[PDB]
Design a binder for this molecule. Structure first.
Ligand code: YRC
Ligand code: ZN
Ligand code: ZN
Length: 232
């Protein structure tokens, strides 16, 4: 009823959308992994009379449900998708998207890691993102590679029309005491990568983490704090 959705308000196997700004939504789904249930976010950005999708809904069935929820709530076709790193909460569902006619994209680093680890593989490579601080335009967003953080390949996404910063899993929610799933992380570089985000997007008004509730710019400093404390 208007609050940001959590696992407790998403019916089993379903997806919810949340309006972030004009022409910007997040998508929220839930998935089980190693015997625990987690929420995860993605982004939808209006691209004229089409939509750009950022990240899958963490699984094939969740991603089919995402497409159906978009059709119900928005009614414009998803034509392209970008996955912001190689983990299943970002690429699981790419096969569903590709068979629905969505063109799927990721950096070459993400594509290599997905292939090596047995995750679904976006079709198209995003060049121009291989050095920290790199940025490229992609429809109504800017894609930015901040450096290694949650993963070595993680990208962030900025919506300049709305000053929305989608940090993906490199950014944690304010209520998080934990640095999340750090299996593939670089804890030593993560604060430096967050500092690059902070420097590049000082006018961000909304910051969306890969999991949990959006907030403001404080999510960036909070993330650096929790990662340093985890490392400590
Ligand atoms: C698919 C993804 C994954 C699976 C399960 C939970 C999470 C979390 C995560 C978020 C937030 C909280 C926690 C956990 C705990 N409390 C939190 O608030 C994150 C994140 O932090 O983004 N991601 C997760 N995977 C798998 C894996 C392990 C690797 C193969 N051995 C691949 O790494 C990874 O991220
Ligand atoms: Zn991840
Ligand atoms: Zn994640």
């Amino acid at each position: 009823s208007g609050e940001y959705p959590t696992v407790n308000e998403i019916p089993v196997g379903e997806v919810r959308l949340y309006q972030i700004a004009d022409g910007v939504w997040s998508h929220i789904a839930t998935q089980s992994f190693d015997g625990a249930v987690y929420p995860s976010n993605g982004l939808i950005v209006r691209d004229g009379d089409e939509l750009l999708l950022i990240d899958t809904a963490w699984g094939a069935k969740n991603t089919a449900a995402l497409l159906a929820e978009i059709e119900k709530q928005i009614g414009l076709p998803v034509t392209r998708a970008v996955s912001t790193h190689f983990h299943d909460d970002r690429v699981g569902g790419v096969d569903v998207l590709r068979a629905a006619g969505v063109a799927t994209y990721a950096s070459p680093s993400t594509r290599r890691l997905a292939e090596a680890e047995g995750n679904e593989i976006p079709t198209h490579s995003l060049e121009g993102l291989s050095s920290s601080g790199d940025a490229v335009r992609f429809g109504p967003v800017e894609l930015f590679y901040p450096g290694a953080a949650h993963s070595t390949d993680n990208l962030v996404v900025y919506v300049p029309s709305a000053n929305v910063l989608y940090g993906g899993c490199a950014v944690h929610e304010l209520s998080s005491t934990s640095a999340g799933n750090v299996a593939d992380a670089d804890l030593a570089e993560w604060p430096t990568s967050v500092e690059r985000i902070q420097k590049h997007y000082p006018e961000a008004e909304v910051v969306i983490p890969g999991h949990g509730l959006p907030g403001g710019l404080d999510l960036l400093q909070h993330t650096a704090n929790v990662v340093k404390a985890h490392k400590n």
